[PDB]
Write a protein that binds this ligand. Structure first.
Ligand SMILES: COc1ccc(C2=N[C@@H](c3ccc(Cl)cc3)[C@@H](c3ccc(Cl)cc3)N2C(=O)N2CCNC(=O)C2)c(OC(C)C)c1
Length: 98
């Protein structure tokens, strides 16, 4: 496992540093510091949407973010968790590999 170990050294957790606008969002959802796993980022974004009440209480897969910093980042007024392409795009641009 010599070469496989070498390759995966320093890359087993894959922490990211959010860009400053996204960092502010994660902090608003109760995150601390500025290094996270991608899983943590998703947890805090979900929490953010809940605490800012950006989801539709009837159609809870729908997020209305156009009011919000999150909408600015995504470049959208709304999105559905069923079609999460804008979120993928945003996180590719707003997470820096450590
Ligand atoms: C049918 O109602 C649902 C179904 C799934 C989700 C959802 N689905 C999860 C999810 C969605 C897309 C991706 Cl790419 C990753 C994770 C995660 C999530 C994480 C980040 C963001 Cl920005 C939005 C949602 N995520 C949630 O954050 N949920 C999970 C369900 N219950 C919760 O308490 C919150 C959902 O999220 C809010 C819009 C309410 C609502």
């Amino acid at each position: 496992q010599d070469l496989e170990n070498l390759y995966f050294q320093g890359s087993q957790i894959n922490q990211v540093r959010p860009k400053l606008p996204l960092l502010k969002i994660l902090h608003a959802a109760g995150a601390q510091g500025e290094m996270f796993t991608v899983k943590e980022v998703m947890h805090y974004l979900g929490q953010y949407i809940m605490v800012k009440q950006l989801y539709d209480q009837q159609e809870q897969h729908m997020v209305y973010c156009g009011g919000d910093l999150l909408g600015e980042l995504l470049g959208r007024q709304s999105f559905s968790v069923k079609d999460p392409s804008p979120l993928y795009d945003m996180l590719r641009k707003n997470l820096v590999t450590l």
